[PDB]
Design a protein around this ligand. Structure first.
Ligand SMILES: [K+]
Ligand SMILES: [K+]
Ligand SMILES: [K+]
Ligand SMILES: [Mg+2]
Ligand SMILES: [Mg+2]
Ligand SMILES: [Mg+2]
Ligand SMILES: [Mg+2]
Ligand SMILES: [Mg+2]
Ligand SMILES: [Mg+2]
Lengths: 97, 85, 95, 41, 291, 110, 87, 252
RNA sequence: AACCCCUAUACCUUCUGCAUAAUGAAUUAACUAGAAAUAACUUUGCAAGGAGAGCCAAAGCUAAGACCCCCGAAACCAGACG
């Protein structure tokens, strides 16, 4: 029970598909391009996460600030509750003070 | 998912569609224009800058209106901009 | 303490501490003595003089006051005619 | 990334291998065998 | 001659450096501690019951109910009005001399905030309530350069060191907006705003800057000869005649009190794209910027 | 960073000397920093570990260590405690010796 | 393969639609046009005359100056009077 | 045929001497030894810092990673508002909601909470040093080849494949021209049909590509570009504001 | 030589102390619990400066690594439905 009885379908990786072969190209776009662009401008993703990092409370606060006016009501309500929950957790509970 | 437009802009998007779109421009201008009401139930600063008496520094001041409730009966009379507080 | 603010995700300063203690850049904290303005009529001049001193905190209190204030309150300042200017740096201190 | 244990079978047999000569349910049921194998060692 | 080349030639005989044989520097990647296994699981470093094991101990500074240490000390205005006190980045005559000796500040031309910032001699933070540089005396004995330097505050002994070498020093006030512009001109020009007027000092600073003993930029020029003579008598040097020097014209260059940059007037727009300068000619505008 | 002007007399009023030309004939080399100073820094940990670091060392760093051992042995009365970091070209000494080491490396042509 | 063209800063001023409801209100002011002029100069297309305050704006600048920034003589006069009272 | 002799443009430290590489050509199979190029020792003979390569390789791999993994907490799973049964009396374990992480179909206690960013920035000087080290390492291990240009006699990929096999260039080759627009159309046609021979402009060079490919091919214009860009970081002041704004001597 | 011989007071939790006749557990499978600042430390870079405006600097400063759980009331309030 719990362990598969046949080998899984073999996994073939093309180590030289175009995505892998060109990975990292232009990561020095600033230092090699007269700093017209910053490498963070190459990051694609949510508008609230490009070239920025934080813990989960900071991300939720940042997402609420920037796209919160555009969120669906159920999702915005969950985000409000999540911020409140993390607010209590990070400010009032834990081993260290 | 996200909405393309902020929800608070949805009412304004509606005015660009349908019968509202075809309303006369001068009427549509009146709607958009949200002029500040004359202060009635609060006393305005009268200036943009004031000296903070506690620390003696020039600080900016703002007039924040007092929310007013206008009962439906006021829409049949002329209360001069007064309402319930 | 507020380790993470709801608006900025930043730790906040306890303003009670700012109103009572002075931080020297070297990491020492200076306080007044408790009761230096209370019932002076019953205190001896030797006691009154002790009560008027500006005194240093111990390591435990220093570490505590450091944690209750943010980094802004530890920066070197260059106030003109600061009465405490010479007390910001240590001299001849070994270990 | 959801990681689940995949070789738990082999972890279990490492105890059960020493319990096979015991009597009763403590020769096959890990919960019971693990305690009697520790005592045996 | 040795280890340097000994490493590159030692690399020739090794496998190729690839993405398969890299590693962090030893000591750079401390291991993670997880609550798993005998040593770190079970109670997992949190102790046994109480508030601490349950994660509910009181805030920082609370002492269990005893009126806490940070509350029972009396309030005293150590930090009252800290945010409106003016700060001055000190510039030493040791540091000024060093900047000149290394070629980072040019003594052949007037030295003001822009030249000290651009030579990376001082770092000014107007947002942290810096009001400029105070010229401090440290290094006065060994200071030899002759300069025309403009600071915001200057010590008498610092002034004596400047003037003993045949140099000139004036103290000038910069309001926080003017200070921000004078410190980073290029970012301001990228705002496309007319150059503003440099404001006057506040009252409490008007006596400092109208006083010749401070070489104030609003001080009476006719009173400077005496004040320069007093320091020479006080400190025992012979005041040089700077009118006789060939750089005398340079040594006399001073900005107008309402002027932020040498050679540029209030109300001009710097067009860095086309390398042009636009001057308004409207009378009302022109009167505003000259007033 | 501008290259330093030529001065009629050295050291300059500030005390700065340029590196010797031609470079000294030694197994190791100490390059100057981007601001043209000798790369000797004092460092502190734990509030009590006074340390001097010599950076930007080329060539044989084990020869530089022996020289620093022999220069500082008389001053200390014993052999200095040192770390040789071949990878980074850095010598680390226990104790503050920044001024002595600067004046000594400057008299070598570095 | 060959790499895609390097990502480059789209040249020239970016003038947004003053009608699209999703254009930031900060990209539509006179201050935004002033920055476009400063970055690109005449190629921006901004009339340079719009860079100085208008007559009504100039009146507001001068009024705030008179109220909050007194003359040198006024401040010297104030210090003289204040000094006599202390003396 | 006069040799192509490239000298270093930027001043070399007196105590150091330039390193050298054959200048080669892709115009024929045996057109090696077309010249001799000096290379700046501070760019092509720096200390071999593999620890810095790992730093820069990991910054490249991770700094742009956005994770999109996400689980629902007990707060976000559908329903689950009511207390399933009374606290006392039933002889069951006490439970507050059917979506606790103990229940099948419950919330996840400490699951991924994406989208999660991994953005960080190694100091610019470290990032520039990683480029030098990779170049120094390629030269030192005989994996670097300098060409005068990347022009081919034909745009046929088999030629470029056969040419690499003849010259013992390895399985993967990274071609660096100076500019994207001014790449010879022949090398563009050959590399576009290949998987392990990759053509990039100079501005796209990076530690991850140089490590992924076994062989690194640089035209001579590229070398001058690289020496200029990387040696600039060694002599620069600390910035006063972003280097994208006007400076006295920058760019060029 | 399976047993007979000899030795041997399940386990977890909880406790001053548990074979305890104290807790929990039929058993199997699967699921099910340590989240992060301050400072410090370690390892690089640059260094009287550092940092890709802001912020720090009386060897600092940048970067990185490394750190703070789970389930459970009786309640309280708001709006519905009876
Ligand atoms: K018992
Ligand atoms: K018991
Ligand atoms: K019981
Ligand atoms: Mg039961
Ligand atoms: Mg008991
Ligand atoms: Mg029992
Ligand atoms: Mg019990
Ligand atoms: Mg039972
Ligand atoms: Mg209540």
């Amino acid at each position: 029970i719990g362990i598969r009885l046949t080998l899984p379908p073999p996994k073939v990786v093309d180590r030289w598909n175009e995505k892998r072969a060109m990975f990292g190209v232009y990561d020095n776009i600033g230092i090699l391009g007269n700093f017209e662009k910053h490498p963070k401008e190459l990051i694609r993703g949510p508008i609230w996460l490009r070239g920025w990092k934080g813990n989960e409370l900071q991300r939720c606060i940042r997402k609420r600030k920037m796209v919160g006016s555009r969120m669906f009501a159920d999702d915005l309500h969950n985000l409000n509750k999540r911020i409140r929950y993390l607010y209590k957790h990070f400010n009032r509970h834990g081993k260290f003070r | 998912p996200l909405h393309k437009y902020p929800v608070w802009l949805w009412k304004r998007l509606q005015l660009r569609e349908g019968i509202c779109s075809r309303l006369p421009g001068h009427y549509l201008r009146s709607l958009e224009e949200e002029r500040t009401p004359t202060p009635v139930h609060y006393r305005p600063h009268g200036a943009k800058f004031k000296i903070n008496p506690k620390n003696g520094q020039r600080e900016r001041v703002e007039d924040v209106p007092i929310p007013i409730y206008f009962p439906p009966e006021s829409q049949r009379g002329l209360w001069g901009g007064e309402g319930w507080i | 303490l507020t380790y993470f603010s709801a608006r900025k995700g930043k730790r906040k300063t306890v303003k009670a501490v700012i109103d009572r203690f002075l931080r020297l850049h070297c990491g020492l904290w200076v306080r007044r003595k408790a009761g230096y303005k209370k019932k002076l009529w019953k205190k001896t001049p030797a006691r009154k003089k002790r009560l008027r001193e500006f005194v240093f905190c111990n390591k435990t209190q220093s570490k505590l006051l450091d944690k209750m204030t943010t980094s802004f309150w530890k920066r070197r300042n260059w106030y003109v005619d600061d009465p405490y200017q010479k007390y910001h740096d240590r001299t001849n201190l070994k270990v | 990334l959801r990681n689940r244990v995949t070789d738990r079978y082999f972890r279990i047999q490492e105890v059960l291998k020493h319990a096979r000569h015991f009597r009763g349910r403590k020769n096959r049921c890990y919960r019971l065998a693990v305690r009697t194998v520790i005592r045996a060692f | 001659q040795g280890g340097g080349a000994r490493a590159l030639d030692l690399l020739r005989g090794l496998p190729r450096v690839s993405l398969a044989n890299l590693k962090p520097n030893p000591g750079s990647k401390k291991p993670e501690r997880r609550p798993r296994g005998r040593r770190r699981g079970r109670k997992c470093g949190r102790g046994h019951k109480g508030e601490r094991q349950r994660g509910t101990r009181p805030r920082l500074g609370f002492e269990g109910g005893q009126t806490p240490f940070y509350i029972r000390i009396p309030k005293y205005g150590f930090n009252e009005g800290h945010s409106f006190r003016r700060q001055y980045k000190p510039l030493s005559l040791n540091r000024l001399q060093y900047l000149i000796d290394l070629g980072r500040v040019d003594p052949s031309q007037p030295i003001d905030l822009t030249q000290l910032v651009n030579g990376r001699g001082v770092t000014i933070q107007p947002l942290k309530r810096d009001y400029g540089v105070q010229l401090v005396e440290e290094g006065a004995d060994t200071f030899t350069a002759k300069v025309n330097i403009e600071v915001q505050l200057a010590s008498e002994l610092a002034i004596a060191a400047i003037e003993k070498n045949g140099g000139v020093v004036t103290t000038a006030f910069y309001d926080p907006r003017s200070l921000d512009i004078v410190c980073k001109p290029v970012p301001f020009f990228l705002r496309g705003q007319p150059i503003p007027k440099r404001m006057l000092p506040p009252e409490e600073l008007v006596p400092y800057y109208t006083d010749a003993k401070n070489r104030g930029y609003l001080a009476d020029p006719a009173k400077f000869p005496e004040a320069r003579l007093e320091l020479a008598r006080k400190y025992g040097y012979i005041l040089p005649d700077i009118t006789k020097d060939e750089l005398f014209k340079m040594l006399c260059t001073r900005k107008d009190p309402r002027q932020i940059f040498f050679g540029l007037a209030p109300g001009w727009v710097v067009n860095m794209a086309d390398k042009k300068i636009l001057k308004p000619t409207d009378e009302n505008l022109l009167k505003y910027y000259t007033s | 960073i501008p290259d330093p002007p030529k001065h009629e007399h050295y050291p300059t009023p500030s005390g700065w000397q340029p590196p010797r030309d031609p470079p000294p004939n030694l197994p190791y080399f100490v390059r100057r920093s981007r601001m043209h100073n000798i790369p000797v820094y004092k460092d502190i940990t734990h509030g009590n570990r006074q340390m001097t670091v010599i950076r930007k060392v080329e060539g044989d760093i084990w020869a530089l260590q022996k020289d620093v051992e022999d220069f500082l042995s008389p001053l200390l009365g014993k052999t200095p405690v040192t770390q040789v970091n071949e990878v980074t070209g850095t010598l680390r000494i226990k104790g503050y010796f920044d001024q002595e080491l600067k004046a000594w490396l400057l008299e070598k042509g570095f | 393969y060959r790499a895609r063209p390097p990502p480059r800063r789209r040249p020239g001023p970016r003038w947004p639609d003053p009608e699209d409801l999703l254009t930031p209100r900060w990209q539509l002011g006179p201050r935004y046009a002033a920055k476009q002029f400063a970055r690109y100069g005449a190629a921006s297309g901004v009339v340079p005359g719009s860079l100085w305050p208008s007559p009504e704006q100039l009146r507001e600048l001068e009024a705030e100056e008179r109220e909050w920034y007194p003359s040198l003589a006024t401040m010297q006069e104030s210090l003289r009077v204040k000094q006599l009272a202390e003396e | 045929p006069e040799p192509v002799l490239r000298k270093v443009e930027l001043p070399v430290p007196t105590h150091r001497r330039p390193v050298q590489a054959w200048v080669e050509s892709l115009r024929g199979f045996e057109q090696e030894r077309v010249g001799l190029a000096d290379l700046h020792p501070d760019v092509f003979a720096t200390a071999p810092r593999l620890d810095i390569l790992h730093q820069v390789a990991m910054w490249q791999k991770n700094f742009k990673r956005i994770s999109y993994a996400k689980t629902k907490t007990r707060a976000e799973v559908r329903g689950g508002g009511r207390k399933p049964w009374p606290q006392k009396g039933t002889g069951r374990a006490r439970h507050g909601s059917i979506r606790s992480p103990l229940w099948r179909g419950g919330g996840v206690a400490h699951g991924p909470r994406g989208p999660t960013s991994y953005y960080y920035m190694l100091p610019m000087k470290v990032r520039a040093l990683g480029l030098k080290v990779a170049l120094t390492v390629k030269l030192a291990q005989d994996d670097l080849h300098i060409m005068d240009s990347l022009e081919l006699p034909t745009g046929d990929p088999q030629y470029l494949t056969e040419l690499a096999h003849y010259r013992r260039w390895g399985d993967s080759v990274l071609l660096v021209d100076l500019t994207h627009e001014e790449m010879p159309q022949s090398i563009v046609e050959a590399t576009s049909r290949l998987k392990t021979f990759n053509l990039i402009p100079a501005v796209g060079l990076n530690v991850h590509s140089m490590l992924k490919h076994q062989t690194l091919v640089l035209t001579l214009p590229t070398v001058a570009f690289l020496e200029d860009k990387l040696l600039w970081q060694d002599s620069r002041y600390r910035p006063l504001y972003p280097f994208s704004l006007p400076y006295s001597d920058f760019p060029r």
